[model samples]
Target chain A: RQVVTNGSPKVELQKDTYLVENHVNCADPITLSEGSIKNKVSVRCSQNSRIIVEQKVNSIFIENCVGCIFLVNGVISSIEIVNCDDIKLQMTGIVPTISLDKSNKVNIYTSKEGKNVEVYSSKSSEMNLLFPWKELAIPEQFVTKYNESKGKLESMVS
Target chain B: RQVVTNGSPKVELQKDTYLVENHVNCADPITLSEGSIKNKVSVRCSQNSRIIVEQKVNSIFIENCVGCIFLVNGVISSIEIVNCDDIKLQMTGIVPTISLDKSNKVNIYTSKEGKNVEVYSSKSSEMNLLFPGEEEGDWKELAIPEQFVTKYNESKGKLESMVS
Candidate 1:
């Protein structure tokens, strides 16, 4: 059970808890700070917003957001992005995992501390992975199809 | 801690276990019968199939499937459907809960015994619910979202959500 908050229009967490927003028109930046790693955060259905989180969080799950920019710095366990489009995520922290699902044009910018983060994705396209010290364009060619020879499913990465 | 079987056009549970499928185009229908509710079943990446679960199972988690038809019965605990599309699910006998997450175009049908079944959904669209008793509905419904506004409440010195 995690704490929940909501906001609109230049949103910021006045408390050290999770923030969730929907259909927010934030012309300015959203800030979340002074939280610990035991709490989870979520931002969903956000449109054209810039978000920043400066706290060590347990996890961050973002979904169905578009045209957003995220900058996070903390000791994080995982970050999950799903069903989103036209978003960029930048992190200067120690994160172990990142997952992207059913998304498009998602750019991940990580620092040197995140070079070893395990990034997993599915049903996604136009994903770019970048580090401050390096950059790599990750391939998105996972196809699961039928094979007439095996009589089962076939999966390949191209 | 359970057994698993694979199938294609014809899948009949030969053992008291879980069945997992991949891209199964089952014209003959999939059937799992004469089993206990202790085991769970999962079917993924299937297309154009009709599935039946007569076993009293712990749960059935279906994912990444499309154009499917389901007919379920017996004393069951839960059913979780995720990332699916174009599904028609019909239930009879007993079931406690059903969850639909990130799915599309789902239609749920229940009998008189399933009148009080609990259903949950999130990030889903195009779902329908029907009931059939000694008399029942060819009708539908939806739920669970309260929209409010949250701004800096200067008097309380905190940002809170309220009726805008």
Candidate 2:
């Protein structure tokens, strides 16, 4: 139903309920397999914690989460807001879609080792393109900014 | 191999190189099967475009894409950066992981209509908790914020907070 963590705790959420965790410390991965989050709630996580969502979520809010790795295997409607600061997100299988509003200080990857990211943005909506850069050939206009520090790139919508 | 977008582009990549698309309109899904993206290259797509990567990739870069949906079925290491304003991300089967660095506003979902997400971070990495009043249980200490605990405690009709 609902699960929360405060200090190195492991829990599972199998129904629709509220979840909150703060100042936690652990090495294992927490799993969320079902349900939706109550509206107008914020999920602030940090301290090198790992989370795994195995189902789908409709909408959510997040902030000030750092050094955390999230591995999602389901579908989510939207992550309303993200102050993405040193956070890692990985997606695979199926089709994982999202709408990101802000944050100019984060890195998003498609594959596990692919070190580049391409982004397309509109006045309201934006897209992040990431994959292997050297193995395939794309167009030229898509090239925007190249981050040599991490071998990544940024693209925009024209 | 090279794949280009041309009037409802229907192309597939079968090598280790770069792929790009400009001002293209497509009704079907563009499949990127059996290959990888060249290092230090960017993929630009926009306007009601759907692309699918059915294989693995080495490194990639992208920017300024809109009204496009990307479906990746293989494994990727890191998406260095993304300004995804209105995009969708879905993952399924096996261990699917991603590294998204920055964004001011965004929405992330795993599978289509599957209400669950699995994350593997450090012991200190926490999860956002929001939902109805009841159905499950967690540690009392996990409810760090006093307000949330008060809400939970009130919903359960308890006089004192459960200090776990």
Candidate 3:
């Protein structure tokens, strides 16, 4: 049921945390954050169960393809848009539980160099680097909003 | 060739006249100051080639989607994000050019809303948005240095130059 992130030097966390948000099932999604965030994707909770998530440091994960954005305390975390038809980022102090059930489009802001974050829940074979919309002046708040969701997803999921 | 914004405002150009950043071809993106702008995506351009890009606007429309975020000065335009993200009123400034081309990222503080800007491009879809990983912390000057040409001198005073 609950994915807790202990305030350890490495931000301790248990394996296979359950997460659920807005009636969406996200137990299969991977989690990434401060320390010990380099874990592989696996089924953490039992079937029909849920999971919880959280973040330790100020991190960012721009999702352009099929990504979803989360928020908490104004600090943006993730930007990975996933198999959803649309994506939007909202600024909020109270983070909400979220999941990338499905998305068709993703929006993300890239740094100077081409280097950015891309995690294909759809699999390495379906790898599609998040790209920006041409000629369309994008808003920065959306980027910050989506970035905030990076770590905020699991925290509120359960 | 030439980018023409036709319609009711037939040839209605913002601040009309030849802009410094023009030419939407295989290469050549545009850049400008910071501000709130609105970019409505053209069906012809969106369905066709990956040309046309814009950045740092209040709202925009890419393809069938409406109002989105984090668009680079590359590839096709995105407008799926709007209702979910917060509005940063602090870092708002003068919107540079309408063209979204080769330009750097604009990071700054703003009113309670925080900083806001869009990056648009042609070939920016196949890119990533990872943070600049370095050990320097907030005051980081350089990280993952590919070629260390010279060490930066912190004690060196601000080198002022005479204005023309």
What's the best-to-worst order under lDDT?
1, 2, 3
Per-residue error (Å), model 1, residue A37: 41
**Could you give candidate 2's per-residue lDDT for residues B55-148 as a string of tens digits?**
5565444444555566654344433324333444433322133333222222333332222222211111112212112333321111111111
Residue A155 lDDT (model 3) = 9
**Tens digits of per-residue lDDT for model 2 on A14-35?**
2443354563555776666555
Sort every candidate by TM-score, greatest first.
1, 2, 3
lDDT of 1 by residue, B119-160 (tens): 565446566666553446543333222112222233664333
True-vs-predicted CA distance for residue A94, candidate 1, Å: 35
In model 1, the Cα lDDT at residue A75 comes to 51
Report the lDDT of model 3 for residue B99: 23
Over A1-158, each residue of candidate 3 has an lDDT whose tens digit, in order, gives: 22232222122334532222232224443333333233322221122222223443233222222223333222224323333433343322321112232333333222223222222221111112222332222111111121333422010000
For every candidate, what share of the true interface contacts is present? Answer: 0.00, 0.00, 0.00
lDDT score of model 3?
Answer: 0.24
Clashing pairs in 1: B37-B56, B37-B57
For candidate 1 chain B, which ten residues in a row score worst on lDDT?
B143-152
Off by over 4 Å in 1: A1-158, B1-16, B133-164
Q: Candidate 1: interface RMSD in Å?
A: 18.3
Tens digits of per-residue lDDT, candidate 3, B19-39, equal 221122323223333333443
